[PDB]
PDB file of all heavy atoms in Angstrom:
ATOM      1  N   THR V   1      -0.896 -13.126   6.701  1.00  0.00           N
ATOM      2  CA  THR V   1      -2.148 -12.386   6.354  1.00  0.00           C
ATOM      3  C   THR V   1      -2.194 -12.224   4.835  1.00  0.00           C
ATOM      4  O   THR V   1      -1.150 -12.090   4.206  1.00  0.00           O
ATOM      5  CB  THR V   1      -2.100 -11.038   7.062  1.00  0.00           C
ATOM      6  OG1 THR V   1      -1.937 -11.278   8.471  1.00  0.00           O
ATOM      7  CG2 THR V   1      -3.348 -10.237   6.824  1.00  0.00           C
ATOM      8  N   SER V   2      -3.408 -12.224   4.287  1.00  0.00           N
ATOM      9  CA  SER V   2      -3.575 -12.036   2.854  1.00  0.00           C
ATOM     10  C   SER V   2      -3.536 -10.548   2.497  1.00  0.00           C
ATOM     11  O   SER V   2      -4.040  -9.717   3.274  1.00  0.00           O
ATOM     12  CB  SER V   2      -4.878 -12.679   2.378  1.00  0.00           C
ATOM     13  OG  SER V   2      -5.991 -12.131   3.064  1.00  0.00           O
ATOM     14  N   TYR V   3      -2.966 -10.230   1.351  1.00  0.00           N
ATOM     15  CA  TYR V   3      -2.857  -8.878   0.827  1.00  0.00           C
ATOM     16  C   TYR V   3      -3.228  -8.876  -0.651  1.00  0.00           C
ATOM     17  O   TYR V   3      -2.572  -9.555  -1.462  1.00  0.00           O
ATOM     18  CB  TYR V   3      -1.405  -8.335   0.932  1.00  0.00           C
ATOM     19  CG  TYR V   3      -0.990  -7.955   2.338  1.00  0.00           C
ATOM     20  CD1 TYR V   3      -0.600  -8.930   3.252  1.00  0.00           C
ATOM     21  CD2 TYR V   3      -0.955  -6.639   2.737  1.00  0.00           C
ATOM     22  CE1 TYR V   3      -0.244  -8.575   4.539  1.00  0.00           C
ATOM     23  CE2 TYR V   3      -0.587  -6.278   4.004  1.00  0.00           C
ATOM     24  CZ  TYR V   3      -0.234  -7.241   4.913  1.00  0.00           C
ATOM     25  OH  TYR V   3       0.101  -6.814   6.198  1.00  0.00           O
ATOM     26  N   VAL V   4      -4.277  -8.100  -0.976  1.00  0.00           N
ATOM     27  CA  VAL V   4      -4.724  -7.981  -2.362  1.00  0.00           C
ATOM     28  C   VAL V   4      -4.676  -6.513  -2.782  1.00  0.00           C
ATOM     29  O   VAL V   4      -5.227  -5.638  -2.091  1.00  0.00           O
ATOM     30  CB  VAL V   4      -6.161  -8.537  -2.528  1.00  0.00           C
ATOM     31  CG1 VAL V   4      -6.631  -8.386  -3.980  1.00  0.00           C
ATOM     32  CG2 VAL V   4      -6.233  -9.996  -2.075  1.00  0.00           C
ATOM     33  N   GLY V   5      -4.010  -6.222  -3.881  1.00  0.00           N
ATOM     34  CA  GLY V   5      -3.911  -4.867  -4.400  1.00  0.00           C
ATOM     35  C   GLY V   5      -3.122  -3.888  -3.531  1.00  0.00           C
ATOM     36  O   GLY V   5      -3.334  -2.672  -3.634  1.00  0.00           O
ATOM     37  N   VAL V   6      -2.133  -4.412  -2.792  1.00  0.00           N
ATOM     38  CA  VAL V   6      -1.271  -3.587  -1.942  1.00  0.00           C
ATOM     39  C   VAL V   6       0.147  -3.570  -2.517  1.00  0.00           C
ATOM     40  O   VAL V   6       0.664  -2.451  -2.815  1.00  0.00           O
ATOM     41  CB  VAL V   6      -1.270  -4.070  -0.469  1.00  0.00           C
ATOM     42  CG1 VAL V   6      -0.323  -3.201   0.370  1.00  0.00           C
ATOM     43  CG2 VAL V   6      -2.668  -3.962   0.124  1.00  0.00           C
TER      44      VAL V   6
END
Side-chain angles (χ1 to χ4, degrees):
Chain V
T1 303
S2 58
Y3 286 79
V4 179
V6 178

